[PDB]
Amino acid sequence: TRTSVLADALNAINNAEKTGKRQVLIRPSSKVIIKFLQVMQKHGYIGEFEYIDDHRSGKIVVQLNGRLNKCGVISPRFNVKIADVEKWTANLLPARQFGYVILTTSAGIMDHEEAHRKHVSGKILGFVY
Amino acid sequence: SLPSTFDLTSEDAQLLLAARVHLGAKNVQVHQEPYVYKARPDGVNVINVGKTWEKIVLAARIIAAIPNPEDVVAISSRTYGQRAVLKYAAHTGATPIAGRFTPGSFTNYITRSFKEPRLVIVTDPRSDAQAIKESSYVNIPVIALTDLDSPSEYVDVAIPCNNRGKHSIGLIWYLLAREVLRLRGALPDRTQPWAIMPDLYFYRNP
Amino acid sequence: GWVPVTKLGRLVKAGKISSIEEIFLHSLPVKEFQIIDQLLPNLKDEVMNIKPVQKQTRAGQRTRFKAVVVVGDSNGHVGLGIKTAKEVAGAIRAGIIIAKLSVIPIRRGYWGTNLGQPHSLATKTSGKCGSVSVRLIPAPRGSGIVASPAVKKLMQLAGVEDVYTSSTGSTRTLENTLKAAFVAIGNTYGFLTPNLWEVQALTPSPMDVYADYATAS
Amino acid sequence: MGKGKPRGLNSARKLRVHRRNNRWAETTYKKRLLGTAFKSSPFGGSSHAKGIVLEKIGIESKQPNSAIRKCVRVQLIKNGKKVTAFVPNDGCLNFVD
Amino acid sequence: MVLVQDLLHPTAASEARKHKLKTLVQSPRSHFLDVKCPGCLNITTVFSHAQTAVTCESCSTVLCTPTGGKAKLSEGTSFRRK
Amino acid sequence: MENDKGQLVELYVPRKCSATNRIIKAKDHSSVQINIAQVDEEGRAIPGEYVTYALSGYIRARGEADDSLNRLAQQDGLLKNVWSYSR
Amino acid sequence: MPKKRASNGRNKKGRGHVKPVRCVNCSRSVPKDKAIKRMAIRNIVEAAAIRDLSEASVYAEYALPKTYNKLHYCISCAIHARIVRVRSRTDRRIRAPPQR
Amino acid sequence: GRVRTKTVKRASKALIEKYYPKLTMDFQTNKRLCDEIATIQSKRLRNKIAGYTTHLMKRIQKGPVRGISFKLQEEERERKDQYVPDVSALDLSHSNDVLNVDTQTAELVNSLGLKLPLSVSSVSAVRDR
RNA sequence: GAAGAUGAUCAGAUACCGUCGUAGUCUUAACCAUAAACUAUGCCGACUAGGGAUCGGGUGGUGUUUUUCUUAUGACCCACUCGGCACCUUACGAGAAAUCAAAGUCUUUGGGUUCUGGGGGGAGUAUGGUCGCAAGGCUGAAACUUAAAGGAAUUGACGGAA
Ligand SMILES: [Mg+2]
Ligand SMILES: [Mg+2]
Ligand SMILES: [Mg+2]
Ligand SMILES: [Mg+2]
Ligand SMILES: [Mg+2]
Ligand SMILES: [Mg+2]
Ligand SMILES: [Mg+2]
Ligand SMILES: [Mg+2]
Ligand SMILES: [Mg+2]
Ligand SMILES: [Zn+2]
Ligand SMILES: [Zn+2]
């Protein structure tokens, strides 16, 4: 089966980056995926991206900037209790300074810093450094 | 940006056609090459000419951009184009390599033929491949005359051309030389077939 | 007794390349060794170990000596040099030379907050050689060089003041470990940050600019 | 490759079970569990044991180094088992009697 | 195909080449061939991959024999496209 | 990078490839600076003025490098008809 | 011990376990893949003897036929004399028919 | 086994490079010249060298060789290259008619230039290889 | 042709070689449930680099030939298409390396799952279970012992290998 569509997409993106492609084609194209992409854009890791309407599920194209290094996805969507966020960041991200840990929460799909600012955490999706 | 002057002269195009710079490549074809202009049936590919010309021009420009002239190391192993290479070298002072390349030429600072280029030029990256590899060890640009089955690994500015050979490679070389001359030199005009000849180049009767 | 081959060498001799920074920027090869010395007078050369090493022969064996040398300062440069020769001193010298040739810069970044001068690594960087993965995680201040002895020494040479490691696989293949560490260090400059998103001009190289002074007459 | 172990968010019990199962390959752990020290191991899983010197016995050493190693056949008091104890330093065996 | 493909708009040739599935949007290349039999003057909107012994509207004429893919149009029969 | 109040720390601020963005390392022996001389009307290649491109080594190794260069040129305005957007 | 080859017995790939063939010389059961199948197309008469036959014979041109023996060899047996010919590691990859 | 040694050969080559003129075919003279020139300690060795030189000269007299192309030889070559037996006419003009180009070629020309001399071939793809 | 007869050879040789040749081999009715059952590569999923072929489907070719005149099937040629039993380079991806286009996208560690392993031996044993007509199978210890056991390759030395 096609489990974690988002994860697959992320993997594809990573592969593309490794190759030195300037853009990616993604099949399934979810809400979560879209959110992630938006977040990335906000941060400054991704160019344009466009949702094709296959009169069906979806189909995204992402413009890679050459800035992404890894665009990871942590596997089961672990339940993060605000203090554990720091730990997670330490585990995943290079440096206290930079990078993000994209985690869904009540407020919306946001990065770790954003969540902290809000004062609202939840379940992790991925990361970007 | 561009002058919008050099749009491939008709005469030049004709010459190229005669050479059969663009009837080469054959059945065999590389995924990194969109210089084709329609496949002629049964064991043939036709090469886009304008694109080739543009590439040549670019190469010439690059060459010009190197300030010290005795520097543009031209190379040729395979026999058809060695003469052409030599001619080119003679025309524009840049120490060439006809015949054997010598491994450890661009690396290996003891060798008698220790060149140190800032711009390598090649005919067949299928054969001279070694030269290209050597260049890749020490940060040099590589210009090369790609047939559409030739590998373009560690190659830049790959002038597309027929490497069945005989007339074509030589002709291409001549064209390149002309371009170089035009971009800073004696020749100030794109027109006039001028005192040189293509047939100075070409493979000779042994 | 100087005399250079290599355009770059000639340039250096002339005195138009100021520091190794320029060289690094234009990734220029340094096949000659003296250039590095000229650039950097503060090269501390430390021999890490010397394995005796034996080819087996119809009669007896060919004892040679794989001398490992680490070279540095405290600026953010390191060299790792391995050579195996029969005369020990000679071998050591060769190793040193190799290290000098290599000498490679290190991006030293901030633990957390800028405040003072930087003496940890910027990002979590790692290397690999055989079955040794040296992972260098950036430390806080004063926390020291938390590493295998050789690794620690290397760090010191570099001018990294505080750092965490996680050397995994067979670390006792000492040379291999050292190599891995070196690789990791190299990877520091290479790992893109948001600090370097901003576009640079692409400067002309000294080799292009001072082309008349370089090359023989 | 998902790599063997279940990475689900509710796959915890299974994981635990697996870990437990694995634990029985680790030797020290096994020993701790089964009480091999308490059931065997001449001593009672203890640091020391007092024992009676039944006789002085010179034992011939393994290999490379060749010698007689002045051991003693000891009978442990608490259990009643019979073991062989090496006696250190020069002489020493005389002292032991 | 390398580095900068620019993936929203391919040349149509490529699309044609690739599987009826493996383009941007799913779109079939089967057609409703509007067949006329030699007998009665009436048009049957025959799908080109019939899967059936395609009779006329009533008369037992037999229009198309369903080959695995596209149907062979039985005997000298005439057709319009779509 | 920027200590306290500017004071740019960390020298050797690297050449980033034109095609990939990918940082060109200190010992990236394969990576190359192409210099393309600036054109003028009727011959003339303007001495001492270039469009300079950096190519990373990975791309070169791949053989996706020439194409990338061509694309770059097209973007700039050093070519016409060569690199198409769609293939 | 590593794999000497990728193929090994060669033809058996996506072929479970095939039928076997008996060797000519040894009569060792060898799979019909790890087999070494040289084709002996000898003339029915010996080279020098052909002339003699001609001298003897009736008719013109003549049949002068060829005997046909597709010989199967148990690898080891083949190695002792036959087409096998122990190669270098790099030379093993070459599957082109030799000579010619 | 009268294989003239490597050192001797090298010496001979050097001599040739230096003094192609003042090396007249015949042997005694050559020997004398060698003696005058280079500091050969031995006599036999000198003789051998002379012989080698003579041989080289003879070879040259029947055309050039590899590793022996010093100055005079280059000049000889060079002149020929400069003033080739060819070319009468252009050459590679439109000597016979106006270029037997293919259909594809013609099309390409049309796309590119405006008005060129053409002779449009049929383009027989042809059976078999 | 295991068993067994028997003829040589060697210090000997119920061993090859040799000759013979019950059981089987083959089959039919029951079992058994093991294999270097080996691709010594679990399955499902996704993505990353070129190339030709090759089988099975299916498109297009005023292509060629069949020839019963247009044919229409058939059979190729060529291009693409999806499909399983299959080469070259660089690897930036890997890997201890042989090598690997997967054994890659892993200290820049998390797509989804099952199963298995934790120095060597003792030991696939002891024991109990269980499964069998049995032979055996599945299941499965410890005491005790020991500093190596392995793997891959490198140079040698050697080989009744070439
Ligand atoms: Mg001893
Ligand atoms: Mg073996
Ligand atoms: Mg084994
Ligand atoms: Mg199958
Ligand atoms: Mg099988
Ligand atoms: Mg028998
Ligand atoms: Mg007997
Ligand atoms: Mg064990
Ligand atoms: Mg082994
Ligand atoms: Zn009807
Ligand atoms: Zn046999």
PDB file of C-alpha atoms in Angstrom, chain C residues 16-215:
ATOM      1  CA  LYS C  16      49.939  38.745  -5.058  1.00  0.00           C
ATOM      2  CA  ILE C  17      48.106  35.920  -3.250  1.00  0.00           C
ATOM      3  CA  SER C  18      47.904  37.252   0.325  1.00  0.00           C
ATOM      4  CA  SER C  19      46.413  34.344   2.316  1.00  0.00           C
ATOM      5  CA  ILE C  20      45.150  30.761   1.742  1.00  0.00           C
ATOM      6  CA  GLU C  21      41.581  32.089   1.976  1.00  0.00           C
ATOM      7  CA  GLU C  22      41.765  33.273  -1.639  1.00  0.00           C
ATOM      8  CA  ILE C  23      43.005  29.849  -2.727  1.00  0.00           C
ATOM      9  CA  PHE C  24      40.154  28.174  -0.870  1.00  0.00           C
ATOM     10  CA  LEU C  25      37.650  30.503  -2.540  1.00  0.00           C
ATOM     11  CA  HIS C  26      38.947  29.577  -6.019  1.00  0.00           C
ATOM     12  CA  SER C  27      39.515  25.915  -4.989  1.00  0.00           C
ATOM     13  CA  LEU C  28      43.000  26.113  -6.471  1.00  0.00           C
ATOM     14  CA  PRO C  29      45.182  22.974  -6.283  1.00  0.00           C
ATOM     15  CA  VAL C  30      48.428  23.153  -4.291  1.00  0.00           C
ATOM     16  CA  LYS C  31      50.642  20.356  -5.641  1.00  0.00           C
ATOM     17  CA  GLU C  32      53.668  22.292  -4.385  1.00  0.00           C
ATOM     18  CA  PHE C  33      54.099  22.368  -0.591  1.00  0.00           C
ATOM     19  CA  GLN C  34      56.098  25.553   0.177  1.00  0.00           C
ATOM     20  CA  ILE C  35      53.207  27.832  -0.762  1.00  0.00           C
ATOM     21  CA  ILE C  36      51.242  26.715   2.278  1.00  0.00           C
ATOM     22  CA  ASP C  37      54.249  27.357   4.517  1.00  0.00           C
ATOM     23  CA  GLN C  38      54.644  30.837   3.045  1.00  0.00           C
ATOM     24  CA  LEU C  39      50.994  31.581   3.644  1.00  0.00           C
ATOM     25  CA  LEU C  40      50.728  30.136   7.153  1.00  0.00           C
ATOM     26  CA  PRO C  41      53.821  30.395   9.387  1.00  0.00           C
ATOM     27  CA  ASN C  42      52.032  28.873  12.428  1.00  0.00           C
ATOM     28  CA  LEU C  43      51.842  25.226  11.287  1.00  0.00           C
ATOM     29  CA  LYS C  44      52.071  22.896  14.280  1.00  0.00           C
ATOM     30  CA  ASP C  45      52.864  19.424  12.920  1.00  0.00           C
ATOM     31  CA  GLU C  46      52.029  16.544  15.273  1.00  0.00           C
ATOM     32  CA  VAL C  47      52.686  12.870  14.503  1.00  0.00           C
ATOM     33  CA  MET C  48      49.709  10.760  15.566  1.00  0.00           C
ATOM     34  CA  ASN C  49      51.060   7.244  15.086  1.00  0.00           C
ATOM     35  CA  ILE C  50      53.376   5.085  13.002  1.00  0.00           C
ATOM     36  CA  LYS C  51      52.340   1.532  12.078  1.00  0.00           C
ATOM     37  CA  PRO C  52      55.092  -0.758  10.899  1.00  0.00           C
ATOM     38  CA  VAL C  53      53.768  -2.383   7.735  1.00  0.00           C
ATOM     39  CA  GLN C  54      55.053  -5.516   5.968  1.00  0.00           C
ATOM     40  CA  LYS C  55      54.737  -6.882   2.447  1.00  0.00           C
ATOM     41  CA  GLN C  56      55.637 -10.607   2.510  1.00  0.00           C
ATOM     42  CA  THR C  57      58.485 -11.771   0.230  1.00  0.00           C
ATOM     43  CA  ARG C  58      60.142 -15.004  -1.021  1.00  0.00           C
ATOM     44  CA  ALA C  59      62.663 -14.268   1.742  1.00  0.00           C
ATOM     45  CA  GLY C  60      61.552 -12.237   4.780  1.00  0.00           C
ATOM     46  CA  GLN C  61      59.339  -9.123   4.637  1.00  0.00           C
ATOM     47  CA  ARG C  62      59.402  -5.450   3.532  1.00  0.00           C
ATOM     48  CA  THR C  63      59.128  -3.321   6.693  1.00  0.00           C
ATOM     49  CA  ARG C  64      57.829   0.191   5.938  1.00  0.00           C
ATOM     50  CA  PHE C  65      56.288   2.791   8.269  1.00  0.00           C
ATOM     51  CA  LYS C  66      52.813   4.301   7.755  1.00  0.00           C
ATOM     52  CA  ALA C  67      53.357   7.586   9.619  1.00  0.00           C
ATOM     53  CA  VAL C  68      50.170   9.593  10.258  1.00  0.00           C
ATOM     54  CA  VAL C  69      50.618  13.353  10.743  1.00  0.00           C
ATOM     55  CA  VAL C  70      48.110  16.066  11.693  1.00  0.00           C
ATOM     56  CA  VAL C  71      49.004  19.693  10.957  1.00  0.00           C
ATOM     57  CA  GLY C  72      47.309  22.863  12.216  1.00  0.00           C
ATOM     58  CA  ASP C  73      47.440  26.162  14.116  1.00  0.00           C
ATOM     59  CA  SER C  74      44.446  27.752  15.913  1.00  0.00           C
ATOM     60  CA  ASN C  75      42.949  29.753  13.023  1.00  0.00           C
ATOM     61  CA  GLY C  76      40.601  27.111  11.587  1.00  0.00           C
ATOM     62  CA  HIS C  77      42.906  25.141   9.261  1.00  0.00           C
ATOM     63  CA  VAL C  78      43.914  21.451   9.415  1.00  0.00           C
ATOM     64  CA  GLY C  79      45.920  18.992   7.356  1.00  0.00           C
ATOM     65  CA  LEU C  80      45.995  15.191   7.575  1.00  0.00           C
ATOM     66  CA  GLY C  81      48.955  13.480   5.940  1.00  0.00           C
ATOM     67  CA  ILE C  82      49.609   9.754   5.594  1.00  0.00           C
ATOM     68  CA  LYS C  83      52.774   8.297   4.078  1.00  0.00           C
ATOM     69  CA  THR C  84      54.458   4.887   4.320  1.00  0.00           C
ATOM     70  CA  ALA C  85      58.217   4.810   3.666  1.00  0.00           C
ATOM     71  CA  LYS C  86      61.120   2.708   4.995  1.00  0.00           C
ATOM     72  CA  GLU C  87      63.254   5.471   6.576  1.00  0.00           C
ATOM     73  CA  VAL C  88      61.134   6.697   9.478  1.00  0.00           C
ATOM     74  CA  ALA C  89      62.145  10.358   9.581  1.00  0.00           C
ATOM     75  CA  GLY C  90      61.776  10.605   5.805  1.00  0.00           C
ATOM     76  CA  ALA C  91      58.320   9.037   6.006  1.00  0.00           C
ATOM     77  CA  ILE C  92      57.314  11.515   8.702  1.00  0.00           C
ATOM     78  CA  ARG C  93      58.537  14.404   6.557  1.00  0.00           C
ATOM     79  CA  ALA C  94      56.551  13.104   3.597  1.00  0.00           C
ATOM     80  CA  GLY C  95      53.434  12.831   5.762  1.00  0.00           C
ATOM     81  CA  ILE C  96      53.921  16.406   6.961  1.00  0.00           C
ATOM     82  CA  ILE C  97      54.271  17.600   3.375  1.00  0.00           C
ATOM     83  CA  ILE C  98      51.086  15.776   2.403  1.00  0.00           C
ATOM     84  CA  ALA C  99      49.240  17.362   5.326  1.00  0.00           C
ATOM     85  CA  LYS C 100      50.465  20.799   4.280  1.00  0.00           C
ATOM     86  CA  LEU C 101      49.283  20.171   0.717  1.00  0.00           C
ATOM     87  CA  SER C 102      45.875  19.116   1.996  1.00  0.00           C
ATOM     88  CA  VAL C 103      45.440  21.977   4.485  1.00  0.00           C
ATOM     89  CA  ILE C 104      41.707  22.681   4.509  1.00  0.00           C
ATOM     90  CA  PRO C 105      39.575  25.409   6.193  1.00  0.00           C
ATOM     91  CA  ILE C 106      37.001  24.912   8.972  1.00  0.00           C
ATOM     92  CA  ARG C 107      33.772  26.829   9.489  1.00  0.00           C
ATOM     93  CA  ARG C 108      33.787  27.617  13.208  1.00  0.00           C
ATOM     94  CA  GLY C 109      30.322  28.619  14.439  1.00  0.00           C
ATOM     95  CA  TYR C 110      28.342  29.414  17.563  1.00  0.00           C
ATOM     96  CA  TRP C 111      27.250  26.911  20.152  1.00  0.00           C
ATOM     97  CA  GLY C 112      24.190  29.121  20.761  1.00  0.00           C
ATOM     98  CA  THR C 113      24.098  32.956  20.547  1.00  0.00           C
ATOM     99  CA  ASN C 114      27.006  34.940  19.055  1.00  0.00           C
ATOM    100  CA  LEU C 115      28.360  36.974  22.013  1.00  0.00           C
ATOM    101  CA  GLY C 116      32.131  36.261  21.682  1.00  0.00           C
ATOM    102  CA  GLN C 117      34.413  34.664  19.074  1.00  0.00           C
ATOM    103  CA  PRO C 118      33.451  31.267  17.572  1.00  0.00           C
ATOM    104  CA  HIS C 119      35.318  28.091  18.629  1.00  0.00           C
ATOM    105  CA  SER C 120      32.887  25.234  18.027  1.00  0.00           C
ATOM    106  CA  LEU C 121      31.662  23.799  14.729  1.00  0.00           C
ATOM    107  CA  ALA C 122      28.601  25.408  13.101  1.00  0.00           C
ATOM    108  CA  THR C 123      26.415  22.404  12.326  1.00  0.00           C
ATOM    109  CA  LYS C 124      26.202  18.740  13.237  1.00  0.00           C
ATOM    110  CA  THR C 125      28.663  17.412  10.647  1.00  0.00           C
ATOM    111  CA  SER C 126      29.892  13.863  10.132  1.00  0.00           C
ATOM    112  CA  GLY C 127      32.432  11.972   8.046  1.00  0.00           C
ATOM    113  CA  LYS C 128      33.165   8.407   6.986  1.00  0.00           C
ATOM    114  CA  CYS C 129      36.130   6.178   6.073  1.00  0.00           C
ATOM    115  CA  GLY C 130      35.951   2.383   5.978  1.00  0.00           C
ATOM    116  CA  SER C 131      33.993   1.518   9.105  1.00  0.00           C
ATOM    117  CA  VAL C 132      34.591   4.709  11.006  1.00  0.00           C
ATOM    118  CA  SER C 133      31.924   7.373  11.268  1.00  0.00           C
ATOM    119  CA  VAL C 134      33.161  10.392  13.202  1.00  0.00           C
ATOM    120  CA  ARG C 135      30.215  12.650  14.020  1.00  0.00           C
ATOM    121  CA  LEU C 136      31.080  16.078  15.402  1.00  0.00           C
ATOM    122  CA  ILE C 137      28.202  17.753  17.264  1.00  0.00           C
ATOM    123  CA  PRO C 138      28.752  21.414  18.217  1.00  0.00           C
ATOM    124  CA  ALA C 139      29.315  21.929  21.945  1.00  0.00           C
ATOM    125  CA  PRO C 140      28.589  24.811  24.317  1.00  0.00           C
ATOM    126  CA  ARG C 141      31.389  27.057  25.640  1.00  0.00           C
ATOM    127  CA  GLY C 142      34.100  25.785  28.010  1.00  0.00           C
ATOM    128  CA  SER C 143      32.788  22.208  27.640  1.00  0.00           C
ATOM    129  CA  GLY C 144      35.972  21.151  25.870  1.00  0.00           C
ATOM    130  CA  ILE C 145      36.924  18.716  23.157  1.00  0.00           C
ATOM    131  CA  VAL C 146      34.922  15.614  24.030  1.00  0.00           C
ATOM    132  CA  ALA C 147      36.709  13.105  21.789  1.00  0.00           C
ATOM    133  CA  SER C 148      39.032  10.164  21.190  1.00  0.00           C
ATOM    134  CA  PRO C 149      42.610  11.248  21.881  1.00  0.00           C
ATOM    135  CA  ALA C 150      43.680  11.578  18.250  1.00  0.00           C
ATOM    136  CA  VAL C 151      40.391  13.253  17.379  1.00  0.00           C
ATOM    137  CA  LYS C 152      40.823  15.682  20.281  1.00  0.00           C
ATOM    138  CA  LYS C 153      44.338  16.510  19.094  1.00  0.00           C
ATOM    139  CA  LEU C 154      43.038  17.145  15.581  1.00  0.00           C
ATOM    140  CA  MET C 155      40.340  19.444  16.951  1.00  0.00           C
ATOM    141  CA  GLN C 156      42.947  21.355  18.961  1.00  0.00           C
ATOM    142  CA  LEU C 157      45.097  21.751  15.861  1.00  0.00           C
ATOM    143  CA  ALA C 158      42.091  23.064  13.924  1.00  0.00           C
ATOM    144  CA  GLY C 159      41.330  25.684  16.587  1.00  0.00           C
ATOM    145  CA  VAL C 160      37.978  24.197  17.535  1.00  0.00           C
ATOM    146  CA  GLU C 161      37.939  24.924  21.270  1.00  0.00           C
ATOM    147  CA  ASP C 162      34.742  23.072  22.282  1.00  0.00           C
ATOM    148  CA  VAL C 163      33.054  20.103  20.530  1.00  0.00           C
ATOM    149  CA  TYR C 164      31.189  16.803  21.106  1.00  0.00           C
ATOM    150  CA  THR C 165      31.973  13.645  19.089  1.00  0.00           C
ATOM    151  CA  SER C 166      30.422  10.227  18.447  1.00  0.00           C
ATOM    152  CA  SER C 167      33.101   8.076  16.797  1.00  0.00           C
ATOM    153  CA  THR C 168      31.452   4.795  15.732  1.00  0.00           C
ATOM    154  CA  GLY C 169      32.600   1.640  13.986  1.00  0.00           C
ATOM    155  CA  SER C 170      36.206   0.525  14.566  1.00  0.00           C
ATOM    156  CA  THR C 171      37.801   3.687  15.971  1.00  0.00           C
ATOM    157  CA  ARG C 172      41.080   1.872  16.744  1.00  0.00           C
ATOM    158  CA  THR C 173      41.885   1.872  13.016  1.00  0.00           C
ATOM    159  CA  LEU C 174      43.410   5.189  14.040  1.00  0.00           C
ATOM    160  CA  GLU C 175      44.372   6.483  10.596  1.00  0.00           C
ATOM    161  CA  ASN C 176      40.906   5.680   9.282  1.00  0.00           C
ATOM    162  CA  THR C 177      39.322   7.514  12.214  1.00  0.00           C
ATOM    163  CA  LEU C 178      41.512  10.540  11.558  1.00  0.00           C
ATOM    164  CA  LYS C 179      40.526  10.509   7.887  1.00  0.00           C
ATOM    165  CA  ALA C 180      36.851  10.350   8.847  1.00  0.00           C
ATOM    166  CA  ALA C 181      37.299  13.292  11.207  1.00  0.00           C
ATOM    167  CA  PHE C 182      39.008  15.282   8.453  1.00  0.00           C
ATOM    168  CA  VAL C 183      36.148  14.507   6.074  1.00  0.00           C
ATOM    169  CA  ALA C 184      33.626  15.654   8.678  1.00  0.00           C
ATOM    170  CA  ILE C 185      35.554  18.890   9.172  1.00  0.00           C
ATOM    171  CA  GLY C 186      35.595  19.476   5.414  1.00  0.00           C
ATOM    172  CA  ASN C 187      31.840  18.898   5.265  1.00  0.00           C
ATOM    173  CA  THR C 188      31.421  21.955   7.609  1.00  0.00           C
ATOM    174  CA  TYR C 189      32.162  24.228   4.590  1.00  0.00           C
ATOM    175  CA  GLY C 190      29.705  22.595   2.209  1.00  0.00           C
ATOM    176  CA  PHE C 191      26.738  22.376   4.560  1.00  0.00           C
ATOM    177  CA  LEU C 192      24.525  25.261   3.408  1.00  0.00           C
ATOM    178  CA  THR C 193      23.058  27.550   6.066  1.00  0.00           C
ATOM    179  CA  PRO C 194      20.488  30.384   5.890  1.00  0.00           C
ATOM    180  CA  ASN C 195      23.461  32.690   6.509  1.00  0.00           C
ATOM    181  CA  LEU C 196      24.745  31.812   3.002  1.00  0.00           C
ATOM    182  CA  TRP C 197      21.389  31.954   1.126  1.00  0.00           C
ATOM    183  CA  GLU C 198      22.382  35.469  -0.034  1.00  0.00           C
ATOM    184  CA  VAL C 199      23.962  35.510  -3.493  1.00  0.00           C
ATOM    185  CA  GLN C 200      27.674  36.260  -4.018  1.00  0.00           C
ATOM    186  CA  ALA C 201      29.340  38.089  -6.905  1.00  0.00           C
ATOM    187  CA  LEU C 202      31.751  35.401  -8.207  1.00  0.00           C
ATOM    188  CA  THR C 203      35.098  37.226  -8.027  1.00  0.00           C
ATOM    189  CA  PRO C 204      37.757  36.730 -10.743  1.00  0.00           C
ATOM    190  CA  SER C 205      40.538  34.381  -9.588  1.00  0.00           C
ATOM    191  CA  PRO C 206      44.179  35.420  -9.047  1.00  0.00           C
ATOM    192  CA  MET C 207      45.098  32.899 -11.770  1.00  0.00           C
ATOM    193  CA  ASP C 208      42.949  34.830 -14.281  1.00  0.00           C
ATOM    194  CA  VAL C 209      43.835  38.345 -13.033  1.00  0.00           C
ATOM    195  CA  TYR C 210      47.597  38.031 -12.421  1.00  0.00           C
ATOM    196  CA  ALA C 211      48.115  35.784 -15.472  1.00  0.00           C
ATOM    197  CA  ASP C 212      51.150  37.660 -16.869  1.00  0.00           C
ATOM    198  CA  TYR C 213      53.103  37.298 -13.581  1.00  0.00           C
ATOM    199  CA  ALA C 214      52.195  33.610 -13.339  1.00  0.00           C
ATOM    200  CA  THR C 215      53.641  31.203 -15.959  1.00  0.00           C
TER     201      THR C 215
END
